[PDB]
Amino acid sequence: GSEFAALTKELNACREQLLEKEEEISELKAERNNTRLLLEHLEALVSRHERSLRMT
Amino acid sequence: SEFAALTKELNACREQLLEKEEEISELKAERNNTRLLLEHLEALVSRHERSLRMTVVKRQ
Amino acid sequence: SEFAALTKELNACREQLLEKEEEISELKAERNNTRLLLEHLEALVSRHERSLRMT
Amino acid sequence: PGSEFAALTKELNACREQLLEKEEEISELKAERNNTRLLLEHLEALVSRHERSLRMT
């Protein structure tokens, strides 16, 4: 019975670290979306101006 | 068989733990590739802006 | 008749000279608008690059 | 007559010299303009290629 408790304390500890890892993942995927959005604006800005210089 | 069921869940949780830290590793590596691009983009833009900034002073 | 020919070419030379000055003015205007974009591109890129630094 | 024609010729010649000078500055501006366009071509290619890569990993 005392071993079941110790085994539970380890699983719970592993569950805590799992969420800590996923919180790290979630923030990384968030940073990626910020990049994707930046790259969208950059591509739009350069293409718009490239066409202007090319077609005048 | 609660002990057995607990050990299996504990095992599966540790598998997902390695699984999640590998994704962190891949995202961090992917993040570094982004930084290298941004470094390069800032370089090309600043270098060209520099050429324009000097041309106005030179051609004057 | 030679004077008349010389004056016409002189007038035409000034007419084309005005066109070039107008072209230069447009080119320098377009150039300045280009620098504005570049400064904006550098600003956006440098900012997001600062967000993606390690610790 | 000969003095008048010569002086008018000098004026036309002066206009011609300034015309080619203006054309030289134009050709330089247009060259710089081509440099910028090429940069934007590489920038566009880079950001789009990287955008497509982030939409997979």
From Swiss-Prot, chain B:
**Subunit structure of this chain's protein:** Forms homodimers and heterodimers with liprins-alpha and liprins-beta. Interacts with the second PTPase domain of PTPRD, PTPRF and PTPRS. Interacts with KIF1A; the interaction decreases in presence of calcium.
Recorded protein name is Liprin-alpha-2
Q: Which family does it belong to?
A: Belongs to the liprin family. Liprin-alpha subfamily.
Give expression by tissue: Expressed only in brain.
Role this protein plays: Alters PTPRF cellular localization and induces PTPRF clustering. May regulate the disassembly of focal adhesions. May localize receptor-like tyrosine phosphatases type 2A at specific sites on the plasma membrane, possibly regulating their interaction with the extracellular environment and their association with substrates. In neuronal cells, is a scaffolding protein in the dendritic spines which acts as immobile postsynaptic post able to recruit KIF1A-driven dense core vesicles to dendritic spines.
Q: Give the originating organism.
A: Homo sapiens (Human)
- In the complete protein, the residues contained here run 102 to 160 of 1257
Location of this chain's protein in the cell? Cytoplasm; Cell surface; Cell projection, Dendritic spine
Domain observations: The N-terminal coiled coil regions mediate homodimerization preferentially and heterodimerization type alpha/alpha. The C-terminal, non-coiled coil regions mediate heterodimerization type alpha/beta and interaction with PTPRD, PTPRF and PTPRS.
Swiss-Prot record, chain C:
Tissue distribution: Expressed only in brain.
Source domain of life is Eukaryota
Protein location:
Cytoplasm; Cell surface; Cell projection, Dendritic spine
Family that this chain belongs to:
Belongs to the liprin family. Liprin-alpha subfamily.
> Domain note for this entry?
The N-terminal coiled coil regions mediate homodimerization preferentially and heterodimerization type alpha/alpha. The C-terminal, non-coiled coil regions mediate heterodimerization type alpha/beta and interaction with PTPRD, PTPRF and PTPRS.
The UniProt subunit note reads as follows: Forms homodimers and heterodimers with liprins-alpha and liprins-beta. Interacts with the second PTPase domain of PTPRD, PTPRF and PTPRS. Interacts with KIF1A; the interaction decreases in presence of calcium.
**Function, in words:** Alters PTPRF cellular localization and induces PTPRF clustering. May regulate the disassembly of focal adhesions. May localize receptor-like tyrosine phosphatases type 2A at specific sites on the plasma membrane, possibly regulating their interaction with the extracellular environment and their association with substrates. In neuronal cells, is a scaffolding protein in the dendritic spines which acts as immobile postsynaptic post able to recruit KIF1A-driven dense core vesicles to dendritic spines.
**What name appears for this protein in its UniProt entry?**
Liprin-alpha-2
Q: Which organism is it from?
A: Homo sapiens
User: Which gene is annotated as encoding this protein in its UniProt record?
Assistant: PPFIA2
Swiss-Prot record, chain D:
What is this protein's tissue specificity according to the annotation?
Answer: Expressed only in brain.
List localization entries: Cytoplasm; Cell surface; Cell projection, Dendritic spine
Domain description? The N-terminal coiled coil regions mediate homodimerization preferentially and heterodimerization type alpha/alpha. The C-terminal, non-coiled coil regions mediate heterodimerization type alpha/beta and interaction with PTPRD, PTPRF and PTPRS.
Query: What's this chain's function?
Result: Alters PTPRF cellular localization and induces PTPRF clustering. May regulate the disassembly of focal adhesions. May localize receptor-like tyrosine phosphatases type 2A at specific sites on the plasma membrane, possibly regulating their interaction with the extracellular environment and their association with substrates. In neuronal cells, is a scaffolding protein in the dendritic spines which acts as immobile postsynaptic post able to recruit KIF1A-driven dense core vesicles to dendritic spines.
UniProt lists the family membership as follows: Belongs to the liprin family. Liprin-alpha subfamily.
Question: What is annotated about its quaternary structure and interactions?
Answer: Forms homodimers and heterodimers with liprins-alpha and liprins-beta. Interacts with the second PTPase domain of PTPRD, PTPRF and PTPRS. Interacts with KIF1A; the interaction decreases in presence of calcium.
Name this polypeptide is given? Liprin-alpha-2
Q: State the organism of origin.
A: Homo sapiens
From which lineage does this chain's organism come?
Eukaryota, Metazoa, Chordata, Craniata, Vertebrata
Q: Which gene encodes it?
A: PPFIA2
Full protein segment contained here: 102 to 155 of 1257
